[PDB]
Amino acid sequence: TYQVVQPINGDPFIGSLETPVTSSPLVAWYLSNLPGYRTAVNPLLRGIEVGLAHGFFLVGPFVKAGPLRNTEIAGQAGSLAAAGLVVILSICLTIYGISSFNEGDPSTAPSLTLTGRKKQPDQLQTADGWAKFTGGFFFGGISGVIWAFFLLYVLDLPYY
Amino acid sequence: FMFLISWRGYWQELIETLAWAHERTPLANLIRWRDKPVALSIVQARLVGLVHFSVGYIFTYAAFLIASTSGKF
């Protein structure tokens, strides 16, 4: 009599369904606390965090699998590539925003809360906010790469 | 051969399941498409298929013509 699997928000005529991986308290808590979902925070602020995390992470694959190392002294220079990819990406984001949102326009996110609490206007998703988000994404992206690289110079890690 | 043998209705139904996926994926549905994703049209398929068939045709024989000749002269 107890099923775990339920229609979304109690509405069976809408797309999604409710499952442990979608509406668990752990999943809900985790996703609500990512920088992306902090609706009430500065978009620029939210971005930098995403950049930092992402940047930092990208150095690994480039350096270890790069043509330049692989026993070739080039080493940590790869990280530099990663610094190049965050530039490409930034470009894409800037483009996505420019094209999507217009200057005058307002947000396109959804104002109703899941519970119907109409009380909430939200987000970046505006020409102004998105620019901020990408702009912060970049700064964070470059800084992420640099600090990972910085660690590379100091060394000590088992993989490289 | 893919564009020439498999036709449109199959791919249209496939894409609309992917349309569902994108909207229901967290962090990903922050980003929305400005152009609705659809399967290539019926004629467009035959054009795209023929171009591949032709490009392959021309590039394959050219690779053989030049190499077998110039390798021996």
Partner: peptide, 29 residues
């Protein structure tokens, strides 16, 4: 070594071109 026009044609021109086309294409007058 002029052979450093390659990336420009090889990458820069394509990136600029793509970005521009993308913008023109998504424009809504």
């Amino acid at each position: 070594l002029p052979s450093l026009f390659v990336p420009l044609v090889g990458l820069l021109f394509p990136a600029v071109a793509m970005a521009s086309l993308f913008l023109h294409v998504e424009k809504r007058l």
